[PDB]
Write a protein that binds this ligand. Structure first.
Ligand SMILES: C[S@@+](CC[C@H](N)C(=O)[O-])C[C@H]1O[C@@H](n2cnc3c(N)ncnc32)[C@H](O)[C@@H]1O
Ligand SMILES: Nc1ncnc2c1ncn2[C@@H]1O[C@H](CSCC[C@H](N)C(=O)O)[C@@H](O)[C@H]1O
Ligand SMILES: [Zn+2]
Lengths: 262, 51, 262, 53
């Protein structure tokens, strides 16, 4: 038995790697976690032996820590590996980006002496740069999970493009609910106001999952975030609040000035 | 009918470019209904996942 | 005339998306910037009408600003579009990740009334998460161009994974050389010492370009960076120097605490 | 050599075969001892020499 975790990208069918597709095609069994039913059918036609990881999510409005869900996902994947199946895990986007199931399964597989690897995929971040025509290198880039940003001390650089992932559950500690509240989001705005004016334009981004679908690129002032219509797939982009300024300290050590910059 | 079309469109750059030239024509030619087409043109994904 | 910029990923042949390969196949003309001659041959067999953008780089010890190189690349791409060719630009990795040529070509094409778009690809960053088994969501991540980090004011969050791209030319202000000096790197170490001790373990990472090639994952103390063997393709990973500290202010507003973090 | 690498990167079946037995798979695709040596020593420079780049 062996394990290969692949990503299918965000868009249907077209955004998976050539090699990653081949892995799915030749797998004994596939464990899937896909955005929609169109993506699900696509997968099943590629390889009919599919087990849908969605099933491990709470079904009947029951309270269940998503950490328990992930554990059952991991154990289900490892069971196939232990049995001797050439197992492939197919997650949407990039399998190791804001996704613990794969990292956990790989760690566990390796420790039990199984071959396990992760193939990189196209993430929501990757889609964002393209859809918004932004290069993360222009003035740099920072990414944080929205809740972690609230629970712990992160200091953002306001010259960079800042991303807050999983903004829809910002401040939702129990990890049972499928969304947060407007008051939680208001607290986030106040926190952000340390570095960003209330009228700072932010962007609610959602990459399209279908080829006939346009992405969501919704601009609004930060102060209006708490009233916004957020979905699980929403990512919040916070563009720079300040332009790049010269670092005279280091330039001096380099023995140059701004005018010497190529 | 709908699912097969979308899978092709997402994978095939020729068809993609055809579609972007004339969405309605390409969709109609692949047998999509008026309601399905309306759904696409209004950007109602939810209704697509029903149809 | 139209323009589509695609990425080919880092690995040969298999790391491009299904859709993006298809774009290359059906293109009238392709402008390429690929890692090696193996990837170049692969491209030519896919579509014989290729112009290699490499030609626009400084040739024969000539002194040339790399900005001039990019301008000539952009102009060459637009010439084909203006002539009416269904043009495809194929860059390695993600075409818009630390790459100005595609963004510039798309901006210029749009302004002259041409259809232009960018398809996301798999970047060196994406490869890094996979190769090092790191999820950027775990404690977040930050990316900066090494030189820009030195020349302008950027403050990293030392709880997050920090990436410095183009570390090999860190402090090479003229943009005419293909590598920097050990003294420039020493100044960078001193600068970083604001947040990271001299004995802090950093990682020089290089994703593989060939299927028979292992990635470079070279661990060393920060202090030793100036003596390290760096390549144009090298990226510097600086793991967290601090564990997360609780944000008591916000937790209190949320009405929760550490033990309440589910 | 170039033909092999293109296939290997694209084809997960061949990839899995390769990782099982690199030398066996390489010899099966007619790679020379010098080429195989370069692969096993991880000398990329030499590989590009043994194709004419
Ligand atoms: C002009 S940028 C090109 C980035 C490319 N578009 C991408 O998607 O990674 C060049 C820089 O990208 C990074 N890079 C390029 N190839 C790499 C590789 N094989 N492994 C690691 N980093 C790489 C390095 O930081 C290098 O200095
Ligand atoms: N279609 C989409 N558009 C934008 N962001 C998305 C998205 N789908 C997922 N995300 C982001 O990812 C979070 C879920 S975590 C899953 C991330 C996925 N592995 C990837 O590679 O992107 C969401 O809360 C959001 O922040
Ligand atoms: Zn990033």
């Amino acid at each position: 038995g062996s394990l290969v975790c692949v990503g299918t990208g965000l868009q249907l069918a077209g955004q998976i790697s050539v090699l990653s597709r081949s892995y799915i095609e030749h797998a004994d069994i596939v464990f899937s976690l896909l955005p929609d039913g169109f993506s699900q059918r696509w997968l099943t036609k590629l390889n009919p032996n599919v087990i849908n990881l969605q099933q491990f999510y709470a079904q009947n409005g029951e309270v269940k820590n998503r950490r328990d869900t992930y554990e059952q996902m991991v154990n289900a994947i490892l069971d196939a590996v232990r049995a001797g199946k050439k197992t492939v895990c197919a997650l949407y986007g990039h399998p190791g980006v804001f996704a613990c199931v794969s990292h956990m399964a790989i760690t566990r597989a390796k420790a039990e002496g199984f071959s396990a690897k992760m193939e990189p995929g196209i993430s929501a971040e990757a889609c964002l740069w393209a859809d918004l025509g932004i290069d993360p290198g222009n003035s740099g880039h920072q990414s944080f999970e929205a809740s972690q940003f609230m629970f712990f001390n992160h200091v953002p650089d306001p010259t960079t493009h800042l991303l807050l992932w999983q903004i829809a559950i910002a401040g939702e500690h129990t990890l049972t609910q499928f969304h947060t509240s407007s008051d939680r989001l208001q607290i986030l705005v106040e926190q952000l106001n340390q570095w960003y004016p209330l009228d700072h334009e932010v962007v609610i981004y959602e990459a399209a999952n279908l080829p006939i679908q346009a992405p969501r690129i919704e601009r609004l002032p930060l102060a209006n975030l708490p009233q916004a219509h957020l979905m699980p797939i929403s990512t919040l982009l916070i563009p720079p609040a300040k332009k790049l300024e010269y670092n005279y300290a280091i330039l001096a050590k380099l023995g140059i000035g701004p005018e010497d910059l190529g | 009918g709908l699912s097969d079309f979308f899978t092709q469109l997402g994978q095939d750059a020729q068809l993609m470019e055809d579609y972007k030239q004339n969405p309605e024509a390409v969709m109609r030619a692949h047998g999509l209904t008026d309601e399905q087409i309306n759904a696409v043109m209004t950007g109602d994904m939810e209704k697509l996942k029903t149809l």
